[PDB]
């Protein structure tokens, strides 16, 4: 705020913050019980509604953790389409979701690159394949600025994550290019 | 395969003329090795090559090399051909020796025995006393060329500009013929 | 054995014969084979093992692991704990971020901060501190941050605080680029921190720490009664305050020094002694009152005729 | 006492406590002058014309360390390492233009600036003395593994995190690519060190932690060349050591703060008592086996450091260790700064004295500094506040040895010539009386014992001649050398610049034989040799009106000034009795004549009767040529006939030159401002109308050249011009 202005506005926001604190709800842990007008539904990377002065950015930063948790579970396509999407065929706008999906794919690759689940010690590969399938079925805005995938790969290249993930990376890329072969062109 | 390499040194000698030389001989030849200037796939396919263009020794007290071109994917090469600065003797002996050493380490490392081929063009008249000063090689420009020709039958041809200086005669000291026979008013042939 | 293993670590480390010697020493060799007339070797072996373990850490890390001669419950938890293949740009993202939302000094990370401090330099230390501090843009969190910072800044109060002040306050008042920062109430919090550490340092202080007693050999003239480093720094900062009180440009810094003078009010305080031989504090307090009774009373040390002047001036 | 500046409006900056300083360049323009006026930007200033001090804004805080590597204008920009090395190459060396080739060391503050390309050439001066070695064995270079080669020597800005405590990674050498990696570096460490890049092998090593307080030195034998787009920096633990000085039961407070090294990583250790204290030290790496005995009746190779020299002194700041010579040579009679070591005294004068002696040298009785160069002329940046530089006497020792002195001077000048570095032995050389003998002996030795490198060192040796004769009196031969150089360059460029049609022999080779032709009637020999194959293109009519006027006005000035030996100057303006140059200019005139026959817009006399003067001009110049080729006459009927001056005399010729620093013997002090008095397209107009690019030798031409097709000249002069260290720019 204005330099030549006093700390009056600061102390006013201070004495007003307990109001919004009393009006706060929770830490937004997790809300994904449904399997199908609704709770926990943000419009554009922002859940809060009131224009008050709440506490620190813990509720100002988008709830990336929530979408992160819900995306890994199958059948979430309809859920995320209802909670964030609208007119999937008449409202193509390519929202900020590209960063979310890039981070999810990076996490998936890292979990796959990390000893390959102790050399196929468990069934993490199954969850990885399911998440990849969901992302491929959600190929409507994925190649919005397609170089996003290259940027995510460059970011995952740190720490030399090409030990064992490479096979899974090629596999998920094959899945995606098969789901979008006749649709897009080779230019992208 | 078609593993050919291109080396030029006439940058300091002729800057503007280099553009026409490129657009008349190298740019059409570049389409023989590429489906079109965009990017494009580039990897260890054997067909990769180098790109060596430097200057003479007179205006160079602290700098001789700034090259970086492992593969260039047959695109970055022609990309930086146009985007290069410019600047008597030519000191092409040093560049020739470096290219020779590079071809040697390629043949010793990139084997498959591999029918190495190369072309070299330099509009500037070369003459210098030092030869390598960096490796076992030691001699002169004449010694360098007779070494590059006689000791090993490295396929090399020289399509010089229409102007001819007093160097072609002395450049016939190599037992393998320089093969300046492809002198035809028709345009650049793809592969004679 | 440990001393010579360290000495051989100070060598080329290509032989590692002392490594095998230490390994044999940690082995089960003395398993009551000979006629050990001790009757207490059991506890003696435990003391020897823990003593071997506490030192030679460089050998215990750079070489193969020992055969576990400790047989205890939990070794020393306090250690390096610094991620090797990561930069230093994590002290705020791993400690300062958490402790801000936390309610204490995170005793675990205290040792880490000690290592970072006695490892790097106080200058960039306090620089990144105030940088992270200038991020809340809300009075309550800035206050909490500065409160907890004053606490974590302890164990090196006097010299670290002197250097911190004499670097950041001139480093902010010198130009207008840094005036951008002090405009925020974080500036007032920083002023409070400054006066607090100054008043604590001026008073009697023992300051006996591990990484301080062995690291208390430096040299500084500050390019600025008696000739004391702390007193010299105090006079320097007072002179810089008086200079910043100058005219021809004033957006943030007059308010900053106003907050400074206000927070300077404190019982049993003795700062700004203002020696009466050739010193500026007289005209400094005159101009400060010429900007309510705090400085008018502070300058009134002993009702000397010097103080009578500033008294008459404050009377107006 | 001389060559010292001051700043009127600036003062001691009472607000800021202090700041460390550092700057050095092994090439031309060796002054950078880190400072803070009254967070401040970085400055750049040259050794000549130091009035026009320049600076440029930085992009970080406190500007803590910068050090270039080669003649290519560059820096480091440490303290979070933003804005790394780059080139300038635009019009001059007065604009940074830091490219995006920077490595973002997040929250760092290193003090390392190193990783040069290769080792310095070796000098067997004491043995060879350049008698008849022809610079072969007198100045050679041992084979050295290039740092990070890939048959091409690459280069990076690898350093050590001073503020950090682990390692440096993520090198992006000259490719603008990311190429991300990671290093461990012994998994532990705490550093307040200074780095030593070049060691014996082609590798890097470094070790220092805190100072004399403890004794840790984490020597890291590292290698980076492993595979494309990756690095595997090793952490080999070399034998650690320290300064035994702390063994004194008297005191232990030493705590060094410099610990500088040199490019020879075996023969120095700059640990020194640096309390409020002074005690220099020096160690070695004398390898020796251990006396394995006393264990019984009767790889042993190990390394244990040895002490070399140490004593108690009184000094605070060091300057530099040693572009020095080689060791293992009994250089007793040698007094030049071979491995010369300097060190600054806190109290005024500087007592620079080499290692292992420490006794004394010439001091000439009446913050941070560094060694400018081999020439003993330091910089006055001592701990005295915001003070400007200063000069010192380059006297190499107490006694005098004129013969040996001039010998050393010629040796170092020949070294500078063969290495192609900058020269500032101005203050070192004796008065210009001997210089004449020196320069003639030098030219004789160069021409005789070239043996054939003369064909590539002619320009260098002529620039050397010009530079040395500039300061003195003999300015006539100076301007003569300038004009000779420029016309020779022009002619040598124009000769093979003909896009003619092929013939029995080469066009240039056929044109060279014009020397073997009659004296008069050019009209015959011109067609007798060749006339058709001389045209290159229709758009060539830009040289006659712009540059061809130069040679015409030049030969006319030579003609008119010939029969005036009665002037109060034996050579007058110039004499040019070489003969060969005259034939060269005659060839130039015949080729411009055939050009005029090919196109009527040639370079005329510009005065009167412009539309057959060229004929009589050619005749007269050929007359003088024949009358002066083989030890001919000089400035009698020839003089009488050339004494006729037709209405064609032009004037106002450039005669390009620049001022200098005539500090003869006692004192010449200059300020920072208000300096105290002491092509052919103009280059000296009345009003300014362009960027007005400046130059040192003769040029003083436009920066973009404002033309369309003269790009040949511009291209040939893109880089530094003839000795163009003073190739600067100036507004207004």
From Swiss-Prot, chain A:
Cysteine pairs bridged by disulfides in the record: none
State the source organism's domain of life.
Eukaryota
Its protein name is Mediator of RNA polymerase II transcription subunit 23
**Known function:** Required for transcriptional activation subsequent to the assembly of the pre-initiation complex. Component of the Mediator complex, a coactivator involved in the regulated transcription of nearly all RNA polymerase II-dependent genes. Mediator functions as a bridge to convey information from gene-specific regulatory proteins to the basal RNA polymerase II transcription machinery.
Q: Which disease is it linked to?
A: Intellectual developmental disorder, autosomal recessive 18, with or without epilepsy: A disorder characterized by significantly below average general intellectual functioning associated with impairments in adaptive behavior and manifested during the developmental period.
Q: How does it assemble?
A: Interacts with ELK1. Component of the Mediator complex, which is composed of MED1, MED4, MED6, MED7, MED8, MED9, MED10, MED11, MED12, MED13, MED13L, MED14, MED15, MED16, MED17, MED18, MED19, MED20, MED21, MED22, MED23, MED24, MED25, MED26, MED27, MED29, MED30, MED31, CCNC, CDK8 and CDC2L6/CDK11. The MED12, MED13, CCNC and CDK8 subunits form a distinct module termed the CDK8 module. Mediator containing the CDK8 module is less active than Mediator lacking this module in supporting transcriptional activation.
- Which compartments is it annotated to reside in? Nucleus
Swiss-Prot record, chain B:
Q: Which GO terms describe its biological process?
A: negative regulation of fibroblast proliferation; negative regulation of transcription by RNA polymerase II; positive regulation of chromatin binding; positive regulation of mediator complex assembly; positive regulation of transcription by RNA polymerase II; positive regulation of transcription elongation by RNA polymerase II; positive regulation of transcription initiation by RNA polymerase II; RNA polymerase II preinitiation complex assembly
Q: What is the top-level taxon of the source organism?
A: Eukaryota
Q: Would you name any one GO CC term?
A: nucleus
Q: Where is this region: Interaction with the Mediator complex?
A: 1-192
Places the protein is found: Nucleus
UniProtKB keywords: Activator, Charcot-Marie-Tooth disease, Disease variant, Intellectual disability, Methylation, Neurodegeneration, Neuropathy, Nucleus, Transcription, Transcription regulation
On tissue specificity, the annotation reads: Ubiquitously expressed. Highest levels in brain, heart, kidney, peripheral leukocytes, placenta, skeletal muscle and spleen.
| MF terms in GO | nuclear retinoic acid receptor binding; nuclear retinoid X receptor binding; transcription coactivator binding
Provide the family line: Belongs to the Mediator complex subunit 25 family.
**Protein name (database record):** Mediator of RNA polymerase II transcription subunit 25
Q: Which organism is it from?
A: Homo sapiens
From Swiss-Prot, chain C:
Q: Which GO terms describe its cellular component?
A: core mediator complex; mediator complex; nucleoplasm; nucleus
Q: Which GO terms describe its biological process?
A: positive regulation of DNA-templated transcription; positive regulation of transcription elongation by RNA polymerase II; positive regulation of transcription initiation by RNA polymerase II; RNA polymerase II preinitiation complex assembly; somatic stem cell population maintenance
Where does the record place it?
A: Nucleus
List the keywords (alphabetical): Activator, Nucleus, Phosphoprotein, Repeat, Transcription, Transcription regulation
The record's principal subcellular location, in a coarse class, is nucleus
Superkingdom to which the source organism belongs: Eukaryota
Tissues in which the protein is found = Ubiquitous. Abundant in skeletal muscle, heart and placenta.
- Motif LXXLL motif 5: where in chain: 169-173
Q: TM segments?
A: none
What family does the Swiss-Prot or TrEMBL record give for this protein? Belongs to the Mediator complex subunit 24 family.
Q: How the protein assembles, per its UniProt entry?
A: Component of the Mediator complex, which is composed of MED1, MED4, MED6, MED7, MED8, MED9, MED10, MED11, MED12, MED13, MED13L, MED14, MED15, MED16, MED17, MED18, MED19, MED20, MED21, MED22, MED23, MED24, MED25, MED26, MED27, MED29, MED30, MED31, CCNC, CDK8 and CDC2L6/CDK11. The MED12, MED13, CCNC and CDK8 subunits form a distinct module termed the CDK8 module. Mediator containing the CDK8 module is less active than Mediator lacking this module in supporting transcriptional activation.
Question: Which protein is depicted?
Answer: Mediator of RNA polymerase II transcription subunit 24
Q: Which organism is it from?
A: Homo sapiens
Gene symbol? MED24
From Swiss-Prot, chain D:
Keywords tagged on the record: Activator, Nucleus, Repeat, Transcription, Transcription regulation, WD repeat
Q: Name one GO biological process term.
A: regulation of transcription by RNA polymerase II
InterPro entries attached to this UniProt entry? MED16_bridge, Mediator_Med16, Mediator_Med16_C, Mediator_Med16_N, Quinoprot_gluc/sorb_DH_b-prop, WD40/YVTN_repeat-like_dom_sf, WD40_repeat_dom_sf, WD40_rpt
Q: What Pfam family is a match for this entry? A: Med16_N
Q: Where in the cell is it found?
A: Nucleus
Repeat (WD) residue spans along the chain: 7-51, 52-99, 100-145, 146-181, 182-235, 236-300, 301-366, 367-395, 396-430
Family from the record: Belongs to the Mediator complex subunit 16 family.
Please give the subunit comment from the record: Component of the Mediator complex, which is composed of MED1, MED4, MED6, MED7, MED8, MED9, MED10, MED11, MED12, MED13, MED13L, MED14, MED15, MED16, MED17, MED18, MED19, MED20, MED21, MED22, MED23, MED24, MED25, MED26, MED27, MED29, MED30, MED31, CCNC, CDK8 and CDC2L6/CDK11. The MED12, MED13, CCNC and CDK8 subunits form a distinct module termed the CDK8 module. Mediator containing the CDK8 module is less active than Mediator lacking this module in supporting transcriptional activation.
Q: What is this protein called?
A: Mediator of RNA polymerase II transcription subunit 16
Origin species, per record, is Homo sapiens (Human)
Q: What is the lineage of its organism?
A: Eukaryota, Metazoa, Chordata, Craniata, Vertebrata
